[PDB]
Design a binder for this molecule. Structure first.
Ligand SMILES: Nc1nc(=O)c2ncn([C@@H]3O[C@@H]4COP(=O)(O)O[C@H]5[C@@H](O)[C@H](n6cnc7c(N)ncnc76)O[C@@H]5COP(=O)(O)O[C@@H]3[C@@H]4O)c2[nH]1
Ligand SMILES: [Zn+2]
Length: 358
């Protein structure tokens, strides 16, 4: 526990780097919001509130940042890419929109949208003269256009259609927070927009470049900051839970494991979204603030680690919002690599976590 307090103390020692670093990110992002609004399609574009540093800037890892550009898109009609409960075709309600230039039938093409997004951004980068910034569009069908700044700091930018209609059927039994946050809050949250991002649905070898995927990062941000059964959790000397510290340690335990196997990238498919998602399932499972007292940090950390282990062991980690979307299927992650991480976390848990030593 005091070993873990030590670990949290160290992480705090870099709270000011990711302060100044994030101020660069916010600075560049604003340049983009200007040029994109000039375009007719992306006219009503704006920043989505998903991050802690500077209100729109999310931190996934040290020196990795994350921004969502939301775009209001009236009259959405969804067609599920069937049996893949998170992936959707997108249609307008038949009568005209400016997004017209991206249709492929009755369908809004994701990659067609993504392509113009990119040329607009790549064009602003080829113009700015103060800083050296570059493009890194590399990874496997990601919706993220990724900028790199002064060879140190990297930003994921995501286009996000905003639908203000009722969440789709695949989320009906998701966001199971009624025991934790309340039936009341779940109705409030599920009244809020949802977002579609242009991560395409695989077709085996390639993709289906007209399919979007659901996102709820703004809900994730809210249930992280408004995290207690008590409405006054973490607001006074008497209600200090360790919920946020427990998510930080989990994210950090994954990053340290990832460095140790930097040789062959044996764990490269694991992700802080996996640790976050699993941490939400624990909160659902332990709903009371009494179950996250601050002086019980070591116990709470174990609770998080075992459920993660169990998720790796069972090859099942449900998306928090779409219960039939299994982030740990073999569609997505090989049997072999999940075995790998179970062995290394199991050992880490059984020996007071030597990965956190000096
Ligand atoms: N900035 C950003 N926002 C996204 O929504 C997102 N979705 C994918 N990616 C990247 O595309 C690639 C494809 O991974 P896949 O989608 O098959 O599994 C993903 C994805 O299902 C899930 N995930 C990550 N972010 C989100 C998110 N905001 N909403 C839902 N699921 C997410 O966790 C898995 C690990 O992905 P990452 O390894 O962290 O980055 C992925 C990866 O590079 C994203 N990058
Ligand atoms: Zn709290």
């Amino acid at each position: 526990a005091s070993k873990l307090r030590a670990v949290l103390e160290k992480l705090k020692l870099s709270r000011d780097d990711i302060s100044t670093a994030a101020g660069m990110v916010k600075g560049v992002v604003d340049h983009l919001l200007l040029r994109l609004k000039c375009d007719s399609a992306f006219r009503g574009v704006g920043l989505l509130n998903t991050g802690s540093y500077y209100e729109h800037v999310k931190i996934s890892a040290p020196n990795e940042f994350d921004v969502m550009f939301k775009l209001e898109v009236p009259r959405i009609q969804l067609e599920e890419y069937s049996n893949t409960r998170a992936y959707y075709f997108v249609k307008f309600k038949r009568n005209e929109n400016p997004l017209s230039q991206f249709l492929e039938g009755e369908i809004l093409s994701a990659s067609k949208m993504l392509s113009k997004f990119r040329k607009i951004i790549k064009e602003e980068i080829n113009d700015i003269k103060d800083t050296d910034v570059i493009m890194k569009r590399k990874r496997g069908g990601s919706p993220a256009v990724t900028l790199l700044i002064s060879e140190k700091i990297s930003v994921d930018i995501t286009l996000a259609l905003e639908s203000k209609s009722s969440w789709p059927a695949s989320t009906q039994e998701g966001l199971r927070i009624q025991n934790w946050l309340s039936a009341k809050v779940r109705k409030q949250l599920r009244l809020k927009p949802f977002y579609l991002v242009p991560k395409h649905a695989k077709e085996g070898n390639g993709f289906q470049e007209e399919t979007w995927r659901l996102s709820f990062s703004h809900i994730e941000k809210e249930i992280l900051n408004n995290h207690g059964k008590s409405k006054t959790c973490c607001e006074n000397k008497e209600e200090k839970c360790c919920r946020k510290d427990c998510l930080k340690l989990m994210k950090y335990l994954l990053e340290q494991l990832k460095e140790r196997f930097k040789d062959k990238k044996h764990l490269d498919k694991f992700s802080s979204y996996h640790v976050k998602t699993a941490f939400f399932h624990v909160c659902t499972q332990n709903p009371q603030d009494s179950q996250w007292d601050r002086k019980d940090l070591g116990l709470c950390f174990d609770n998080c680690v075992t459920y993660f282990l169990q998720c790796l062991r069972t090859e099942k980690l449900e998306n928090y919002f779409i219960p039939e979307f299994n982030l740990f299927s073999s569609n997505l992650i090989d049997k072999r690599s999940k075995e790998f991480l179970t062995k290394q976390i199991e050992y880490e848990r059984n020996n007071e976590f030597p990965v956190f030593d000096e």
